[PDB]
Automatic annotation (TrEMBL), chains A, B, C, D, E, F:
Protein's name in the database: DNA helicase
Domain of life: Archaea
Family the UniProt entry places it in: Belongs to the MCM family.
Leader peptide range in chain numbering: none
Gene Ontology biological-process entries: cell division; DNA replication; intein-mediated protein splicing
DNA sequence: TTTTTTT
DNA sequence: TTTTTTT
């Protein structure tokens, strides 16, 4: 149990202060690859590195990824604004990998709802790379008032049917003022071998955003990390849910 | 005919006071395997054991398993709070097995609605392990009022279209604030060797929850105990229903 | 034209007083098979036996089977209460068979609406045995008032949107307090043999309740009796209706 | 232009007074075949007979068949009530045949809307014989008021949402109090052999009621008479209509 | 740019005053063929005859056919009322033919929207002759008020959901009170002659009314004149249209 | 970042002032092919030409094609009004081509939203050439007020439910007063020959207007330039969008 | 034109 | 569980 404020700081300290077995501040060397000719938009954090330095925090990103990842991103944000005088940089993703507990798609249960889980499996499908509105800026066509609504890649589009200012039910989505990011859906299912004779390989759908889009093709063995999310089955008539994996970090493996 | 209040107490006694042919308070030994390293969340109760000690009660769990099981669980809850000083432990399932009457899928009818029955048979289907919302929490996006509605794994999702506080018809389900449990659907049919001549084997769909989830695969001979539950089919304006078996306990058998 | 009150009595007398060609009070020997080890829940009345004793009543079960059947059941109810002192016995079905007019599925018309008819044919389909709510006991969740509404196996479910006592539009169906019976749909059509060359058969769908459920399988030649019923052609937006045969008695025949 | 009152009388006179080339009052001989063992429910009037006796009326059943037919039916009702002392007989249909103008399906046009037309053709389909509510008797479940609303076999069911007496919006259809008649749909089209090259065979759907139900099977050459009716195309989005032929009389012909 | 009033007169004059190369007032000779034993309901106007007499008006029927045709019909209405004392005659169609610009189906575009065009082509389809409601009459079933709404054969049906008098949302279309005319759809495409051997022949759908109904079959080489009309595509969401050719005159040609 | 005002001028200058390696004011020779017997309605601008002359502008048409294309068209407008005394000519399209970055259908992403991109691909489909309302003039039928609303070919039809003047909810589109243009949809996908044949090729739909309509058939290898546009997926219960390519120039290529 | 009474 | 961007 650690609140955001301190996490950011602890994360900041982790990044600049962590050193491996050679004195490599590797995370300084990764906050550096953020500012080159071909810049990256995310920082790959090895969980074991975070654990050894501060396991008390490493057991928060797992038990509370929405705050943990978010906080760590504010941390990268700071160690740039301070240690490199860069504020111009867009948003950078905190992508944790190499977790302790490595589940199987069939094992994913309601226990893991909104917890960062790690999953091994094989990709069976990959969708088209489609634009996702990460921030929908609505505009009023009566007074011209602007309304900001952040969206979530697994939740449905959250509109607004009434103006905040003049109360006019004449609101439209302004594509230009809005923020868009690449998005790609994909499915992975436990490899047939790991299972047992009479078992039906079980699959899970997942989401990829920004830089981790188009990183895998059907038939790749992968080890994804990510937040287990839940939603209603299409119809939305019963109290049973759909499991979606909001991927936080994906990494191939040749078995 | 026995109300809850007494059943709780009678169950309490049964648990701590029952002894087999060797003076084993077996249920004290099972209330024990609730507190260990690898804790279980349910007490397997042999019906014959209940019957021999208190057959008037044993004939209530069968005629009224909603009250019956529920009472027994409050019993286990008490014999922990008193005899072990533990109140931290979550909820523990009272799972009855080895009933006297053992039906065959085909003989399951309207007489058994909401009575605990016992069925032997062979699993033909098992669904994905889905999160079920045991207790749903709706949130208003106008006044932020909270409304709690418990759901039932066989009944359809019970929503609320209007705010209890401000009466705003702008309510949404909050996934975090809600409670979830593992859920799995499965089908079983009569063993063919027990049916006669030109009979075609009948089936029945069922539900597993929490600990009993993913305990059986397609092709297993099982003996399930359960509550026979009914609900209206693909419409909602016809007085015909659908038999669903809310399994209370499942146990394998190699014939 | 005979009212219920007198029918009950005339039926009572019929059962106890009727003798065949050997002085067999056959119906006394049948009301007897109701109280045995393996009890039956219906009394199979030959229409010819009723006609010969009282044809003025036998022409009432045909022209008014709702009253006719109902009255004859109160008669079996009384001849048990008086002649055998039994009042514990549940409800017994008066099922008439062997009528004079034996129709063919294609001949069934508007004329027969709500008259007891007799049909020969072949069974083409049989549905699953689902529970039918014969008596919906609605409960208010504001004042706890109880409302009883009998249902009809062909008609749509008749709910109630407002409380009879407090007028609260918060009513629900109570499964337990309600009475359920086994139900099974089935379809019979004309034998394409006695149906002109390269023509086509028009079938009928039928209903079975309680004891007569699961008595036939697809391919059986049967001779059913029953009430011809009618209901709005699926989507209730046209003046045309659908013929349903609420079966009152079914009997096989090997041709 | 002749009003109902007079039409009924002239029709009455026609029936009893008409004598062919042998002094046969044939229509007396057909009002006769109404009262026998195997009674018919319609009088088959040859238009040519009507025309020669009264051609000014025969040019009314064609230009205004809803009045014409109805009037002639009251006339048959009267020439039974006076000349045979029968009033018990139900309703009898005045079915006209053998008109001057014999149309081809493809020729039936807007001109003929609501005129009695004659059409030769080939039956391509016949529907099931369903019950039609010719008179929907609505019953109020608050005051028990009764409301009669006649229905038309091509128009949609006309209900009534409010009580005529107490104004309670709790009205239902009473199956028993209502009048039902046999109904059967069927389609006929010009036959491909009779067409002039590029043209592709056009069909028309029709309605049969009561006695004329189930008179034809698919593949019969027929010469129907009837009232050309119009309705919206299923969707009801465009000002273009569907041609339905309310049959008034049908007669086979072996070519 | 000429307003209606003047056109009517200019047309009136044209009809009675025009003479060819032999002094034939041909149009008088055609307004004549209107009154005969076998009357026609349309006057075929050659555009070249209209052009030579008054080319400033001829260039109005093309640029504004809706006014042009309509004015010319009022003209024919007048030169009957005055010059022949006939007012009983119904409505006569002003059908122009032989225009200067003669398009090819593939050349028909947005330019031509609502301009009278001329198209040569080959008929590939013809629909059934259905009744169109040229003038629809709505009647209120609460106060009985009547509302007239003229329809257009290409646009969708224009209803009215609220009463003009009492404002009751209980309005229906009265078939009888309404006016219907014959209607027939048809398709033509470019005749696969003049059209480079590697083009996919483009086509267009058209509408015929009254007297010009059923004038061509599939496989006819025709020269149509017509108003190019558009309507919102499929969903009526999108700002896209559909080209329909409301024919104003059709004429065969044997190549 | 350059505002419209200046771009117009800079573009004006570019057109009249640019000279190749031969002193050819090529664009003067092209603004010339605008006035001739067979006039074109678009100026085809090589990006490279714009780039060498003014590379700070050429990196605006790409980064801001709405403003950029628009601007250049006002420039073409001016260099006609001044240098040729023509103001009668309609609207001329500025169509850039031969861009530096030439994407592949699968590569097109969120980054390119509203930027002019270049795409090589193979045409797989082409739609019918339907009229598009580029400017919808709405007319009120109560006061006669006119309201201009420009449309976009990919966005849905923007109507107006209320009159600007008298507030009458009785508004209709006036087809005449509106401006229309030919429209044609078409799909292109990467060629799977130049893409590991173990992948499923991905496509993109596009829009063609005016003069670029009907320039390609299915199977053509093309190099389109255009604006990448986004709209929601059919249903619209997702913050996930659909990519459409509003073509700004299309050119064939024989590989 | 509408395509089985219910699937 | 969902089944492709879509007629
Ligand atoms: Zn506003
Ligand atoms: Zn609220
Ligand atoms: Zn109440
Ligand atoms: Zn009433
Ligand atoms: Zn009214
Ligand atoms: Zn207005």
């Amino acid at each position: 149990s650690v609140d955001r404020e301190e996490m950011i700081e602890r994360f900041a300290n982790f990044l600049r202060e962590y050193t491996d077995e050679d004195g490599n501040p590797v995370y300084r060397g990764k906050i550096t690859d953020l500012l080159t000719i071909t810049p990256k938009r995310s920082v790959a954090i090895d969980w074991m590195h975070l654990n050894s330095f501060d396991s008390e925090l490493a057991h928060e990103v797992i038990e509370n990824p929405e705050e943990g990842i978010s906080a760590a991103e504010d941390a990268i944000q700071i160690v740039l604004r301070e240690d490199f005088q860069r504020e111009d940089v867009g948003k950078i993703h905190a992508r944790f990998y190499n977790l302790p507990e490595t589940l199987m798609v069939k094992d994913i249960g309601a226990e893991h709802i909104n917890k960062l889980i790690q999953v091994e499996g094989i990709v069976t499908r990959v969708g088209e790379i489609k634009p996702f509105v990460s921030v929908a800026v609505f505009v009023c066509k009566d007074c011209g008032h602007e309304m900001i609504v952040p969206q979530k890649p697994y939740e449905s589009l959250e509109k607004v049917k009434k103006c905040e200012q003049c109360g006019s039910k004449n609101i439209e989505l302004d594509v230009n003022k809005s923020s868009f990011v690449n998005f790609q859906s994909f499915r992975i299912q436990d490899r047939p071998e790991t299972l047992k004779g009479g078992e039906m390989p079980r699959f899970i759908d997942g989401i990829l955003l920004d830089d981790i889009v188009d990183v895998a093709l059907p038939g790749d063995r992968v080890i994804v990390t990510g937040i287990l999310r839940v939603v209603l089955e299409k119809r939305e008539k019963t109290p049973i849910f759909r499991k979606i994996l909001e991927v936080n970090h994906i990494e191939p493996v040749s078995k």
